[PDB]
Design a protein around this nucleic acid. Sequence first.
RNA 1: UAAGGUGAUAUGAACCGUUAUAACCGGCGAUUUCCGAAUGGGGAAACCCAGUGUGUUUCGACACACUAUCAUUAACUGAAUCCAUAGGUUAAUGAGGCGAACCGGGGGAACUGAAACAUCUAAGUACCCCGAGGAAAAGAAAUCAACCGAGAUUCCCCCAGUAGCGGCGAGCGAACGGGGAGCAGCCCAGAGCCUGAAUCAGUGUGUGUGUUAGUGGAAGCGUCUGGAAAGGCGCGCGAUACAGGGUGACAGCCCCGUACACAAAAAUGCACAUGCUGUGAGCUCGAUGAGUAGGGCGGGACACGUGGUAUCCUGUCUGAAUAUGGGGGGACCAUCCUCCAAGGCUAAAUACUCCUGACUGACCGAUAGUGAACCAGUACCGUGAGGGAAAGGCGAAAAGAAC
RNA 2: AGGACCGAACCGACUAAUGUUGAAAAAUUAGCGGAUGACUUGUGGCUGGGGGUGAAAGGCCAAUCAAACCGGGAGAUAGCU
RNA 3: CGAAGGUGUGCUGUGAGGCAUGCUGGAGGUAUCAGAAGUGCGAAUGCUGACAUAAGUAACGAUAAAGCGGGUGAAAAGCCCGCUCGCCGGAAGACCAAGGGUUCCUGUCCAACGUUAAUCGGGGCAGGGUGAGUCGACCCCUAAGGCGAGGCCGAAAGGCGUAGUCGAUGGGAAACAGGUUAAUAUUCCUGUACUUGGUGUUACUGCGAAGGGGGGACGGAGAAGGCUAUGUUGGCCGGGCG
RNA 4: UACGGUGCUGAAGCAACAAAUGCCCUGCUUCCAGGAAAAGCCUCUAAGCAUCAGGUAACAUCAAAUCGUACCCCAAACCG
Lengths: 102, 77, 46, 63, 93
Amino acid sequence: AAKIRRDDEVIVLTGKDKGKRGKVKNVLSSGKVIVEGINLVKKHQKPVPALNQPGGIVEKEAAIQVSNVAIFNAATGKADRVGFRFEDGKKVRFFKSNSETI
Amino acid sequence: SRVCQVTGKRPVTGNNRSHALNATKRRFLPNLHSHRFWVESEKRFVTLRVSAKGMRVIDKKGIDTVLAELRARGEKY
Amino acid sequence: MKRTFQPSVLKRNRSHGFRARMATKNGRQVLARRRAKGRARLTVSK
Amino acid sequence: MKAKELREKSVEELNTELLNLLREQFNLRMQAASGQLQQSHLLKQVRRDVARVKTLLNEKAGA
Amino acid sequence: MIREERLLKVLRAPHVSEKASTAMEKSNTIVLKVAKDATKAEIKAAVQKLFEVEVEVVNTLVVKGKVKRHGQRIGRRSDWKKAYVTLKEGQNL
RNA sequence: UAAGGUGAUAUGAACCGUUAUAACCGGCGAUUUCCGAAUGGGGAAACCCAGUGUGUUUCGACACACUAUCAUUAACUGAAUCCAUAGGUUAAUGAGGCGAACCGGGGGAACUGAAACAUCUAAGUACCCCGAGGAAAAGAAAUCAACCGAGAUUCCCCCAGUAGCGGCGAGCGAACGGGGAGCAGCCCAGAGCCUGAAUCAGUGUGUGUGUUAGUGGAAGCGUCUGGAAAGGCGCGCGAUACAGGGUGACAGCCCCGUACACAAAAAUGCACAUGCUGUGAGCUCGAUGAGUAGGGCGGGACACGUGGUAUCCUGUCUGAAUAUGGGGGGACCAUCCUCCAAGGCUAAAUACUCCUGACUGACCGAUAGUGAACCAGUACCGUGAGGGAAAGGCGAAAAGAAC
RNA sequence: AGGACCGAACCGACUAAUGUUGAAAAAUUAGCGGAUGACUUGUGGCUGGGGGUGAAAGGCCAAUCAAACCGGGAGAUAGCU
RNA sequence: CGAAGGUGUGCUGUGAGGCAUGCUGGAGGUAUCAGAAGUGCGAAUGCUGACAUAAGUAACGAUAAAGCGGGUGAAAAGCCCGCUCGCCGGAAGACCAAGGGUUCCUGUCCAACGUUAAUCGGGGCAGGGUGAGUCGACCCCUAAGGCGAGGCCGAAAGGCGUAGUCGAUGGGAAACAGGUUAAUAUUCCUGUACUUGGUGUUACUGCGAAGGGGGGACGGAGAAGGCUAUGUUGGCCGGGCG
RNA sequence: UACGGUGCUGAAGCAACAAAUGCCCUGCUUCCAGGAAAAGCCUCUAAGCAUCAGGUAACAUCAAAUCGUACCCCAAACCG
C-alpha cells in the first residue's frame, strides 16, 4: 500500500520548506503529493477570452516528492516512518518508534 | 510422373562422364511402360504404369498380391 | 514526351495487386517477405 | 446493477434491453449532438449498461 | 419488418448547416447523419418509428473524410452518410 | 489489492469512488464487424452476388444456421452390359494456412583456387522444393577386431594433418584404437498352454511441487557550505537486508525495494499414488524377411578421382543358397575368426532461439549500438520485386515568461 | 478504282537555326514526308532474360540492353591503382 | 569552497607530452602499478554533417501587352471593382473518360510554399459541399485471354486442359423541359412521362427446358436522295432617332 | 433595394431560303481481302403438370436496393 496518503498531515524533510508541516491536499500517481501552503510557486497565467479571466500572478502549490515528506507523529512531535501491521484482518498503518496505530 | 507404380522407381540423377572426365548432369529414367494386366479374381484388366521389372515382380508375386500392396499404400489403380 | 508511367488502376491491381500476389507460389513468398520485413502496405491495392 | 439484472427472466431483460436502447441510448445521442446534454457521462454508463444486459442475456439463454 | 434493435442504431445525429436549414424551411426535408451501413428502407422506417412522422422518400449520399493534420502528422477523418429525408405535408420534426 | 480513478500526446469538461459491485492486477468465461487458408459462387483483399432450411401475433420484408475442395470410412443409388465396376448423392472424421533457427530427404550452381585451364577445387556450399518434431536423425551388429577380445545409436577430446586419395598438382583427408558425456532394450513374420501377469497409452481422483495476482519486510539525528543535501564535520542504529533504482549534489537507516518468511477462489505444467478402459506378460514348440544377396553395363556415396579397389546405393539387363546355409574380415584364393541382411519400434547424451523471465558484461553511448533510443521498415524513391533515411538531452519543479 | 494525286486533323521526323549549368535527361521555331492504308488510335490481353520480339538496327524489352531489373552466392577475384 | 569539457596565460621535458592557474561550465574525475585495445588521420576523384568560393554574378521559364481611376490595407505594377487596350476562338471555349483525390465553395492568416510583393492563392486553419427506378458502375451475356473439379502430364514446386467459371474495350429495360445553391443536379423542385419485376382480383386459356429454329448479327469504298441541327434574310414585336 | 440584387409583371414568339462530316442508313450500289460471340427477345415442343400449376390481357397495389456523383481533365490538379 501507500504510506503517505490523502487526508494526512505531514512534515517536509528536504528543500525550501524543510521543517514545515502541512496537510496533504492530493497525491499524484507520479509519486508526488500536493501539500497545502508548502511548495508555493508563483505562476502567472493569461486571461483566456473564454470563461472567467483572473490574469495576474497566482501563487499555487507545487507537487513535492513523496519521499520528501514524512507524516507528523504529534505524540513525539517529530517526523516518523510508517509500517503496516495487520489488526483484525485490517492492514493498518502504524508509526514506527512507539509502534502506535495511526 | 515417371514413377513405376509397383516398385516405386523415380528418375534419379547422375553424370555424363566423358573420356576427359567432364561431369555433366543427367537423369536416369526408369523403363516405364503402360501395360494392361488381367486379374482373374476380379475378371478385369487393370492397367498400370509399371517398369519393365515391375512386370518381373508381377510375374513372380502374382498380380493380386501386387494390387493388395498398391491398395495397402494408397496407390490408386 | 510520353513517359513510362501511364497509370491505370485496373492494370495496377491485376498486375501487382493482392489477389494476384496470392494467386501463385512466388507471390505468396513476396507477401511473406513484405510481412516479415514488416511493412505498412503489402501490395498496392489502394 | 449486476445482480439486479441477474435475477430477472429473459423477457424482462429484453424489455430493459429495448428500454436501454430506446429511451436512454438514442435520446442521448440525439440530445448530445444537438448542443444539449451537459451531462456527457450518461452516454458511457448507458452503453456499458447495455453491455451488461446483453452479457446476462447471453449467459441466461442456453450456455 | 425491420427489428427495432437495428432500427435505433441507424439514425445518428441531425445535420445542422444552411443547406439543411433551407431544405427544412423550404422543401420539408430533414437532413440527418445516419449509420454508414444504413439503407434507405432502414432510414425511412427509423424516421417513421422514432420521430413518428410520415416519410415520403429518402435520398442518401456518403460523405468522404478529409485528410487533416496535427503538427506534421496527417490523418483522414472518416466517411459518414447523410440522408435527405423528404417528409409529407403533415410534419413538425 | 485498493484510496484514489475515467490509457498517451493532452489540458479540459462530465463524472465514478474512499472499507468496498471506483480503478488497477490475475484465473476462467462472454462478445469477437470485414478481409485473409478464406471454405456458398465470384473478385481489382477488406467488395459484388446467392441457394437451401428454420422462425418471424404489420410473417408485402426481416433474423439465424448450413452450403469449398481433397483424403478415408459408411449408407443409398448407379451406366455402356446381364450380374457387376466406373460414376452420382448424403453423412462422419481428418487435412489445408502461417512461423526465426535447428533436422531429414528430393534437386543443385558459379565466381574462386590451381598464380592460365578442362580432371580437381569451391561444394553437396548458396539456392529452390517436400516433410516432421520439440528436437529430428541414427540405433540394438549379416559391426569391428584379430587368434586376445569388444559389444546398439548420438555427441566431445585424441588418434592425426597420420595412413592414404590427389593434372600424386592445388588440395582433400580417414579408420583402428584410447579417454569421456549418456546408457535401455524390444516387437511382428505363430500355434498351443494361459489370460488379464509386468507394459505403456487414454482418461478421472488424491498428494507434492512449479507457473499465472500478491503480503509483511530492519535501522538517523544535529550543525556548516549551498538554490536544494544524500556532501563536510559530530554522535548514533540496522544488517541472513551495503543487489539495484529514485529522491533538488554522492543516502545501509527518505521512498521503492533487497535478504528473509509467507500467500491462490480458479486454470494449469511436471512427479508420485490410485480407479476404469485398451493393451498385452510368461511357458513349450516351430518359423526365422526372393526378384533378394550376388553378377554385367552406366552413374553416385565412401578420405579413396577406376586404380591392383574392398564396401555401400541403384537407372538398366539378369539372378542364388536359404543354419549339413549365407555376409564380412580392402583385388583374389584357401585356412581360421566373427556376424545373420533382404521387416519394424525405441529414452538420454545432441543442434537451435521467432518468444517469455531473471541476471551478467575490461560491449556501444546518438556519424556509435539494431536500418530504427524519437508514432522506423516510417518519410521518401521505384510499375514492381525491392531500396530506405534524417531526427535524443530547458529546468530540481513549467514556476514554461502576468503586465 | 487506287499500298492513286494535292492538302488540314492524325502519324512521323528530312534540313537549318536556337537550346546545350536547356523551358525540355531529345525539345522549340521555320520550312519537311505520309495522310483509305503494309495507316493511325483507345481499352483489355499474350510472349521474359541466353529468353521474348524484331519489314534486321545488336534495335526494343519501364530515361538501363553484344544479354533487363531486384535480391542472394558475396567481403567473387584484382601479381593493378 | 566547484569535476569532465571549452577557452586563455605561465612554467616545464629531447620529443610525443606534462603541470599549475584566470574565465565559461555545471557533475563528475581518477593517482600509482599492472591489464586489454574499435589506441593517435591531412591526403584514399574517402563517408556524413556544416560552412565558404565564384557572387549579390547568371537567371526569374514562350516577344498574347498593357494603361488609368476607385476600394481594401500597415504597405498595391500584381488582389477586388470599373473603363479602355491586346491575345485565343476546330481553342488558350465547353463537356467528360483515364488519372488524381477535396484541389470545389465560404470565412479567416501571411511564417514557409508562389522563382519578386502579396491584402491574393490549387498555401495554412476552420466550417460547408457530392441527393438517382431512368446517367454510370454493380447486374444479365460474352471476345481476346485468365483460372480450372475431375483429367492427361511432370524429380518436387508445377505445365496443359474438359465441364465450368471469370473477363469489356462489345450485346442487354426505362426522363425530358424549365427553375434553383456560394458550392449538386437528366439526381432537388415544378410540369409532363416512361420501364421492369413482385403480389392481388377478374376474363380467357394448354403451360413447361443447362433442348430445336429465328433473331441479336455486325466488312471496305462509293453514290445520291429525303431530312434535321444550325445559320442567313424578310415579317412581327419592343426600344432608338442619335 | 443590407446596391450585391430581391420579388412582381411581361410584347412578338412567324415565314422563305441555305444547309451538314449528324439522322433515314446495321439502308443502296459495288468490291475482294469475304467481314465477333453469347444472352435479353420471339417462337417450337420433350420429360412432367393437366378441372391444379403456369400462360395471356385489363385493373389495382408494392418495389426498383448498393456504390459513383464535388473539382481539374490538352492541364498550375493526370504522366514529365
